[PDB]
Write a protein that binds this ligand. Structure first.
Ligand SMILES: Cc1c(O)cccc1C(=O)N[C@H]1CC[C@@H](NC(=O)c2ccn3ccnc3n2)CC1
Length: 167
């Protein structure tokens, strides 16, 4: 039993809700919140911009030190950093950005990072400003993630489309 509330169950392990991931994180304080990161951990907009804003820029400060030490992530890769005031940990995961020409096959590799964590609060990878089709992202999530994932979808219209079209 966990503290996530109001989710629709899609499969044995995947749950979905129309919710602002920032507000959901602040309420649940999950062990792991997933950020829709880029390789530079520059949290300017989208989910990353919103999460970072909620940390009063502490996420960005921590991220800049991480990059200065380690260099950029790989597309499809991830790193674990602090969750600040939102979660115990933040798993920064880089889905391919379609508006940069990156291979959509890398989306499965990106979701594989979730399997290293028993339970996660997450957005749909490569959705929103990353330019991929969120219906496809949900399909890859369901077919790749085996751990327990709670997906927060900000846009109500998109949420209804995702549920109504789910196979
Ligand atoms: C006032 C304030 C603070 O004090 C601290 C932090 C943020 C805000 C603030 O202005 N929040 C607003 C409202 C929520 C917005 N969410 C998104 O853009 C977003 C995009 C994609 N997503 C996928 C799942 N969830 C997602 N959410 C961002 C703008």
């Amino acid at each position: 039993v966990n503290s996530f509330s109001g989710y629709l169950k899609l499969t044995d392990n995947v749950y979905i809700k129309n919710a602002d991931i920032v507000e959901e994180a602040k309420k649940v304080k999950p062990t792991v919140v997933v950020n829709a990161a880029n390789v530079y951990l520059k949290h300017g907009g989208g989910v990353a911009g919103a999460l970072n804003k909620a940390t009063n820029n502490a996420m960005q400060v921590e991220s800049d030190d991480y990059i200065a030490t380690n260099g950029p992530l790989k597309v499809g890769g991830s790193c674990v950093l602090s969750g600040h005031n939102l979660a115990k940990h933040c798993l920064h995961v880089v889905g391919p950005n379609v508006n940069k020409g990156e291979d959509i096959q890398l989306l499965k590799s990106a979701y594989e990072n979730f399997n290293q964590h028993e339970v996660l609060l997450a957005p749909l990878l490569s959705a929103g400003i990353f330019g991929a089709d969120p219906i496809h992202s949900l399909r890859v999530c369901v077919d790749t993630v085996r751990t327990n994932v709670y997906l927060a979808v900000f846009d109500k219209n998109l949420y209804d489309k995702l549920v109504s079209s789910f196979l």
